[PDB]
Nucleic acid binder design. Structure first.
Ligand SMILES: [Mg+2]
Ligand SMILES: [Mg+2]
Lengths: 397, 106
RNA sequence: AGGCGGCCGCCCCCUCGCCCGUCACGCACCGCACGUUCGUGGGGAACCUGGCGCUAAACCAUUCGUAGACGACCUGCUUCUGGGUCGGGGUUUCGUACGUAGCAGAGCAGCUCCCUCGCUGCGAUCUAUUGAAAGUCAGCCCUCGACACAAGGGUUUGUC
RNA sequence: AACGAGAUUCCCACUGUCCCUACCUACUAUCCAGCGAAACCACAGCCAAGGGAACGGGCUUGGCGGAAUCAGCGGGGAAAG
RNA sequence: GUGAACAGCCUCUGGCAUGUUGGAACAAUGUAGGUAAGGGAAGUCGGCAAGCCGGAUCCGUAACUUCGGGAUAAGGAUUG
RNA sequence: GUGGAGCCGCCGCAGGUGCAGAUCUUGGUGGUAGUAGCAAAUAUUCAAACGAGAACUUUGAAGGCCGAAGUGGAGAAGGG
């Protein structure tokens, strides 16, 4: 009775069903609530984390001791090829919640959407949306497909956009696109719907959605750690060495008279692979990746104004366990939920903030692309064989 | 139902890995079997005795990191199984594995 | 939670689709209950049945390792940007391989041109070849060089 | 004095005893082929309050209540011996 | 063989199939063995448990004493 | 319906006279349950042969252990 020594609860009860999430792709539980006074835009975007590096920047912050000095920061980078818009969804508001009014898919649909609509693309006859594409072309279906837009415009009040990723531009194995469903927050619902009729089956890049030194959310599924015990899932204290039948256990799990174990106690089970939202991640740089062949392959990523060197942000030796980033990227200050190669959904924040850490301008000075596959100490292959010199590598001429 | 014969490098260092010390060379002979019942295609994989000597030449726990084998697809006889082909995997010693790739001996 | 409703143009058709009066018949089943509707209700199963339409997808096995105690989960499997195995690069780890060469080497022994670097042998090490050798995805990166391989199975699933 | 697998207090040295835990290895546990018991058992098995042999699982009044199960777990069965 | 040694470790003569089962996997909790930055008993009824020290050679050794001891005191130096 | 050689009514007579309990006695069968388990002493592998049939038998080959205070070679008691 009355522990003699106060101590707080281990772990949070706000994440209490520590369960394997029912989704691999992170689900936006809440898009930013809009007013129609803003211009028309997207709110969320799919991306794949490649790995981390660090950075050097001249941080401007009056008052602090950090002021006008170089300060390193951990940065993750997220490989984001452009999405491609396929569908328009309409949601009508009810006294029971939102309800999908109807959907309209694009006139002709890609290979990697259609692969997401199967559990065995090999055994399939590859037959999805084959009868649906023939109502865009017949005279009778075409007048009642554009009637489903005019009924969408009349009744439903929030509309969303079904877009998928281009997995062909990615070093992964998967080749199934991830099919997201993202809310447009424009002006009126007629302009909000005409902005998506304009731009079905077309690409939407990542710089069109997000901006530099702007602060977003990251939604994804965490690193899965498996079935772990009390002291690792819940960070409970170990018992002393002298304890019979075990160290890594919680000793008492309840009193007598509530004759029943509580949900509030800690006990062993699945650790990791949980659906989480990190808030207030600042974007450091929007990347542009491996452009036109007039100059044969301008790598040119991670080449700041203070660097002025032909570098590319993929490190020396490649990203470990990921591949090699040939596409656009968004780099974020700090750690981000997920394993490498995991789909994570970037999203503009709901809340507005000033805080003087948001809205500050960041100007880079240096990105290292040194080898993460060991204790690497060089940053380009030009830089190494200048220092290393000739070897027994060529040794024929 | 061919009579083909190829030769191969098997790096065992990739193929047994994270295996404990006393199960390390015995798995290295059932991974040669799993290699050979994948490629020639038949479940009846025979290996000769001088390849058992080849893997086990350095104890259990230090298997040589790569060996050169050749796989001979041959057909069976004398009141046979519903498998009528067998593979004889025999051991060819070599001095270097560098730039040695899968050739087709005839 | 629209599954419901209003209007109009042509059409096989009625001219009794109501009230009052006339004329006279139909099972009048001989006192008797479960009568009279919704209604050609709902669900299931097959047959005779005209017309218009459709020609799939799950699960297992195999693969992967972003996942796992086991199930579950994420993926691949096109006859050629298909991915698998070898090979090659890149990366990186340790720290300079064996052999050969040396007028390098504390010295010691033998031989004789008795020889104030005479010659040879033994000898930890040292120097050169040698930022060498060895390993490196099995859960690293890029390959498309060389070999193959892929439709090959199994179990079921339909809305009067 | 010497000697104690005797009792105790301090100091140096040392260390995961602790801050505060982490990772690796073997043998299991786990899954499979085979083989396979025992303690225990009124009927059984979700709770809150009331009354009651004054601390119900069943009774009263409420809360509520879907098959079949797996790896764990030590609150309860005022658990077993 | 190593060594002070019928110690320990490794082999020959002679024995044996890993002790009443095999396979796959490498989660928790265990049992047994390690390792840990900075601090060094702050843990605990208690330095429990683990770790330090350890062989030999050369020095160098106090209080106390039943003059025998203590004493491998303690404290250093070295080792191919 | 099975069964295959005995049986009952009435009037009197006589009892080792009727079960749910005794942590009853003896016998049988469950649930737990295809569960706990088959984890002390480092280790097995390839081919072959005989066979209806081989992780375990034998034979060869490789890799290991015991390591002469033995998992080796003979005895005493005991067994038979
Ligand atoms: Mg919400
Ligand atoms: Mg914490």
């Amino acid at each position: 009775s009355h522990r003699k020594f106060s101590a707080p609860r281990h772990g949070s009860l706000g994440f209490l069903p520590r369960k394997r999430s029912s989704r691999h792709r992170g689900k936006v539980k809440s898009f930013p609530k809009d007013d129609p006074s803003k211009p028309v835009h997207l709110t969320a975007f799919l991306g794949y984390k490649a790995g981390m590096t660090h950075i050097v920047r001249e941080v401007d912050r009056p008052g602090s001791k950090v002021n006008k000095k170089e300060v390193v920061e951990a940065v993750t980078i997220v490989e984001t090829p452009p999405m491609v818009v396929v569908g328009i969804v309409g949601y009508v508001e009810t006294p029971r919640g939102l309800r999908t009014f109807k959907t309209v898919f694009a006139e002709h649909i890609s290979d990697e959407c259609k692969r997401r609509f199967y559990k065995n693309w090999h055994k399939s006859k590859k037959k999805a949306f084959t009868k649906y594409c023939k109502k865009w072309q017949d005279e009778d279906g075409k007048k009642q497909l554009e009637k489903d837009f005019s009924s969408m415009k009349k009744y439903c009040q929030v509309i969303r956009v079904i877009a998928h990723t281009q997995m062909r531009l990615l070093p992964l194995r998967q080749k199934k696109a991830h099919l997201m469903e993202i809310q447009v927050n424009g002006g009126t619902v007629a302009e909000k719907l005409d902005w998506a009729r304009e731009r079905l089956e077309q690409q939407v890049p990542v710089n069109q959605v997000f901006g530099q030194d702007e602060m977003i959310d990251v939604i994804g599924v965490t690193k899965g750690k498996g079935y772990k015990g009390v002291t690792s899932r819940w960070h409970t204290k170990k018992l002393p060495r002298k304890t019979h039948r075990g160290l890594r256990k919680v000793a008492c799990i309840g009193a007598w008279h509530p004759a029943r174990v509580a949900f509030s106690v800690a006990r062993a089970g699945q650790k990791g692979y949980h659906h989480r939202t990190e808030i207030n991640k600042k974007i450091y740089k929007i990347g542009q990746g491996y452009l036109i062949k007039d100059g044969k392959l301008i790598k040119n990523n991670a080449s700041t104004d203070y660097d002025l060197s032909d570098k590319s942000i993929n490190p020396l030796g490649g990203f470990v366990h990921y591949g090699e980033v040939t596409n656009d990227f968004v780099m974020l200050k700090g750690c981000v939920v997920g394993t490498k190669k995991r789909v994570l959904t970037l999203r503009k924040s709901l809340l507005v903030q000033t805080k003087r850490r948001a809205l500050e301008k960041i100007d880079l000075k240096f990105i290292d692309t040194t080898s993460k596959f060991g204790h690497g100490r060089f940053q380009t292959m030009e830089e190494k064989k200048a220092f290393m010199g000739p070897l027994k590598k060529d040794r024929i001429a | 139902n061919e009579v083909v014969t190829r030769e191969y490098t098997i790096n065992i260092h990739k193929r047994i890995h994270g295996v404990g010390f006393k199960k390390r060379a015995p798995r290295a002979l059932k991974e040669i079997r799993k290699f050979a019942m994948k490629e020639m295609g038949t479940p009846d994989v025979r290996i000769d005795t001088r390849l058992n000597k080849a893997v086990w030449a350095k104890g259990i726990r230090n298997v040589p990191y790569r060996i050169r084998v050749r796989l001979s697809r041959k057909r069976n006889e004398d009141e046979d199984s519903p498998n009528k082909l067998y593979t004889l995997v025999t051991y060819v010693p070599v001095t270097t594995f560098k730039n040695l790739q899968t050739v087709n001996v005839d």
